[PDB]
């Protein structure tokens, strides 16, 4: 169903934001 | 530091998005 | 209800984004 | 500067999310 | 670099948000 | 409809995220 499809896409965005946060922590530890 | 604080805020946003996904599956069921 | 919970989570996300913006200005200034 | 421009764009995204929340509350009310 | 990597992930987030937007439009189509 | 408005707001957020991605590339350049 399409709501389950959107839910999976949000789960994918959440994973990408976590990846950005990890990168910023590296910029700060710069 | 300020950049580390921003990163922690992004992690909080991700947790909120996962909660939205859980709610959407409940709506569908 | 489930949709209202989703809206509340979006409002929380917006507050977190405003905090990130303030921190960016402190980095700049 | 450019960081201040990004800050402004994040403030705009926050405003737009707040609008989506407003709209979802309206769907739920019906 | 790390900023360019963040930029790429932000672009992917934007693409997924557009897919969500399209699925929302399809939900409106039944 | 309201879902369609939400979809368009998500598209606008996606555009702002793309602009942030551009500015981050410019900061890196720079
Ligand atoms: C039937 O009923 C259906 C209802 O269906 C409802 C569906 O509702 C769906 C809602 O979906 C909502 C989705 O929201 C996504 C929100 O994404 C936010 C993304 O934020 C990114 C923020 O990124 C910030 C990056 O900042 C970098 C700073 O870098 C600084 C470097 O400085 C270096 C200078 O030198 C030190």
Author numbering:
A (entry chain A), D (entry chain D), E (entry chain B), F (entry chain E): 1 to 30
B (entry chain C), C (entry chain F): 1 to 29
What does the paper say about this structure?
Here we describe efficient routes starting from validated parallel and antiparallel peptide assemblies to design two families of α-helical barrel proteins with central channels that bind small molecules. For targets with antiparallel helices, short loops are sufficient. However, targets with parallel helices require longer connectors; namely, an outer layer of helix–turn–helix–turn–helix motifs that are packed onto the barrels.
We solved high-resolution X-ray crystal structures of three peptides using ab initio phasing.
